[PDB]
Structure formats: C-alpha cells, structure tokens
C-alpha cells in the first residue's frame, strides 16, 4: 500500500529487494551490510537509507543494544534529510524515529521529531494525537491539552483525542468536565481508547461525583482484561500474585519485620513527633489529588528503594532499624514514610499503581475515635504499636473525623510471592 520508492529508487528496485529479502529471512547482519553497501553506492536513495535504519533497528532488538538503536535513530533521520523522499516513507521513518526515541527515554528528542512531523503533515490529525502523547510523556499537560483541543476542533468525535483530553481534564481536577470525554472516547472503540488508564479514571471521576455507574465501568474494564477484578485496579502488575485485601503478618512471611516494628514502635513514634515539632517542613502535603478535603502530609524515608539521606537525618534510629529489612528498603515499587492526617479529612476511594507491593501501617498516635480505613468491603482502624497489612492495589478509602491528629508509619514491602529475580528487574514505581 505505501509508496516508498521515488523515481530513482524504482530503477534500483532489484538491488533494494535483494537486501530487504535478507532482512525478512532474519539474516540481519548480512542485511545491514547489504543496505550499507547500497547506501554507499546510492547515497541519495531514501529506500536504501530506510533499509539500513530498519536493519539497525532489528539488530538492536537482536543484541538488546541501546547503542545500536541510537544508530538506527540517526539513520531514520537521515532518510528525512535526503532529496525527493516519498511522503509515505518520510512519515514512516520519522514516526519510527520518535517511537524508538521514546523507547530509549529520549522524550525531548521524540517531541522534536513529533513537532517536525506535525509541521510536515499539517492535515494528519493522528500525528497531532501522537504529539499530544509526547507532551504527556514529559509531563507537559498544558501543551498536550492545547494539542487535543486543536484535534477536537477539527474532528470532534476523535475517540483517541477524547480520552486523552478527558484524562488531562481529570488530572486537572476538572472531574465533571472529564467524564463525557472519557466515556464517549472509550465508547468510540477508536484505536488506542481500549486502555486501562481511561477505565480507571472514568470510574474514579464517576465515584467522586457520586455517579453509581462507576462500577459498571470497573466491571467492563475487568472483562476487557485491564483489571484483575473490579476491586483490584492496579495497572503495573505481575500476574499470579495472591490477591486479597487484608493480610496477617504470618501470611506475608515478614514476621521478623512486623515484630521489629511493634517491639520498637515508641522510638518510631518519638522521632515522628520530634519532626512534627521541630522540623515540620519535612512533612510534605499529599500531591496526587486524592483528598476530597482536609489535611494529609507525608515524611518519606525511602522511595523507589532509595534512602533519602536528608530525611533519615531526622529519623536516624528509625532508618537504622529499617536498614535490616531489605524486603522493604529494597522495594523499588513502594515507600517508607510517616503519614499524618488531621480531622476533617476524607481520602477519595483509590487504588495504588501496582500489585507488586503490600502495605504495612504501624499505628503511632491514634485518636480513640474518628479514624478508619476501608479496603474493598472491609473497614478497620489502627491501634498504637500494632501493624495493619493490606494490599493497596485494592480500592481503599480513609476518613479522619477525630479531635486531634493521627500519625501512622507506612512500610511497603515486596509482595511475598515475588522471586528474587523479579525484585531485581521490575521497573521502579
């Protein structure tokens, strides 16, 4: 279907086909050399240049080499710099360039490539949709929003643009506004809309406005394979891990860690209170839009398996105690943090990002009334000096209606059924 050959390339199609045949047979090393020879002999040929880039691309996959892929990324750009490049080939080459740049984490580089594509093909709205994804990947929601507004102004029923626009509105706390876009976009069935992120946030937005249809969308997302269940809606998962909202210490196998937390709870409390009194700026307000109302702040000692050295200066005995337990300090998909919550606080029902962690809560200062946590269909409360354990990949919700502050210590651990190989290789979250 795509027209990849300009006038000159048509005359050398026999040589170009012979090289491409080598690539399709899996003789990648022979294919690279053959296209390199064609590039050497026909330095202006776009198809020869693209063949070289495709072979370098395949070779990077074979050898799992970032450096080989960087070479391919440059050759894809070289295609675009040649004279008389067919429009189909120009688009294919720069699109793959941007895709591979994103794979390498070159998000700024991918954005420049996508901006070039949009400038070269001003009527291609799918390219503008790709550009919006580029802005979203660097965290530039403002520019992403402008891009999808431009798309929706031309094609109002673009489902891909709708879900991404609705995602941005929802991230901006424009909850009611986001629902029709997320809903209509998912319902369009357009390529790219069947995504767990959009089912996740549509249901959450509906929950926040009191729309009872929220769980029909969790149920459909489960039926389409995005969620392990309607209750457990994490999106960064390892399949097969035991799934239950509440855990006992013995069920986790982390009984030595639990004993240490409970035996030594007062020193953990006292260091948290000292920071509250003398270094309160170390407690940072929750910043994921998870509160309906109230005050909730956290003082984080470990995140992504990395010790925060300045934070541990403020709780040195607690950090010294916890260093004996790699099951938590090495949990690169979890945190270790103090969590203070004040009266008048309601945390929206929400789910964590991954099923690969379990969460321990050690009670430190718990008012006698008013504080409770629901996980799935079960509500519990904290006790001073005692550990609660739940899987926060299940929907959970917290209220604080006491007459004074509530302080807990949160210790994330690797899910106990994850092998050591998985604990070393899983991407940090």
């Amino acid at each position: 279907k795509p027209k990849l050959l300009n006038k000159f390339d048509k005359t050398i199609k026999a040589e170009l086909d012979a090289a491409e045949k080598l690539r399709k047979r899996g003789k990648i090393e022979e294919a690279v050399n053959a296209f390199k020879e064609l590039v050497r002999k026909y330095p202006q040929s776009p198809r020869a240049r693209y063949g070289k880039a495709q072979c370098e691309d395949d070779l990077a996959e074979k050898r799992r080499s970032n450096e080989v892929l960087r070479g391919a990324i440059e050759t894809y750009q070289e295609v675009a710099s040649l004279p008389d490049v067919p429009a189909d080939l120009l688009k294919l080459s720069l699109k793959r360039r941007s895709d591979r740049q994103q794979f390498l984490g070159h998000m700024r580089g991918s954005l420049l490539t996508l901006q070039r594509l949009v400038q070269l093909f001003p009527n291609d709205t799918s390219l503008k949709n790709d550009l919006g994804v580029g802005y979203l990947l660097i965290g530039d929601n403002d520019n992403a929003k402008k891009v999808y507004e431009e798309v929706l102004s031309v094609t109002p029923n673009d489902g891909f643009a709708k879900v991404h626009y609705g995602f941005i509105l929802k991230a901006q706390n424009k909850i009611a506004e986001s629902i029709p876009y997320l809903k209509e976009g998912i319902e369009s069935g357009d390529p790219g809309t069947d995504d767990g992120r959009f089912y996740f946030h549509l249901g959450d937005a509906m929950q926040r406005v009191g729309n009872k249809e929220a769980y029909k969308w969790y149920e459909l997302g489960h039926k389409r394979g995005h969620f392990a269940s309607v209750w457990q809606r994490s999106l960064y998962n390892v399949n097969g891990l035991k799934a239950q909202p509440w855990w006992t210490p013995k069920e986790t196998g982390y009984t030595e860690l639990v004993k240490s937390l409970e035996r030594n709870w007062k020193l953990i409390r006292d260091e948290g209170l000292a920071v509250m009194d003398k270094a309160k700026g170390l407690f940072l307000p929750e910043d994921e839009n998870l509160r309906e109302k109230g005050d909730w702040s956290q003082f984080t000692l470990w995140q992504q398996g990395r010790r925060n050295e300045n934070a541990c200066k403020g709780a040195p005995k607690t950090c010294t105690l916890l260093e004996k337990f790699p099951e938590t300090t090495g949990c690169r998909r979890g945190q270790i943090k103090y969590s203070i919550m004040h009266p008048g606080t309601h945390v929206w029902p929400h789910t964590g990002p991954t099923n690969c962690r379990l969460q321990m809560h050690l009670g430190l200062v718990i008012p006698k009334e008013g504080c409770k946590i629901r996980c799935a269909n079960e509500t519990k409360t904290w006790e001073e000096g005692k550990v609660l354990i739940f899987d926060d990949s299940f929907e959970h919700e917290v209220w604080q209606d006491a007459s004074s502050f509530r302080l807990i210590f949160i210790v994330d651990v690797w899910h106990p059924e994850l092998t050591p190989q998985q604990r070393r290789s899983l991407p940090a979250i």
Binding site: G105, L137, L235, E288, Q303, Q335, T351, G352, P353, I429
Partner: peptide, 18 residues
C-alpha cells in the same frame, strides 16, 4: 511526577531502552 499512592500520571515508570 511519581505514582506513589495513586495512578494519576500518564505513565508511572521511566523508559530506559533495553
């Protein structure tokens, strides 16, 4: 940003190639 308690970012992991 980072996905700590929630799933609010477009992606929660960072891309580092192979």
């Amino acid at each position: 940003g980072k996905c700590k308690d929630g799933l609010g970012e477009y992606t929660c992991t960072s891309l580092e190639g192979f």
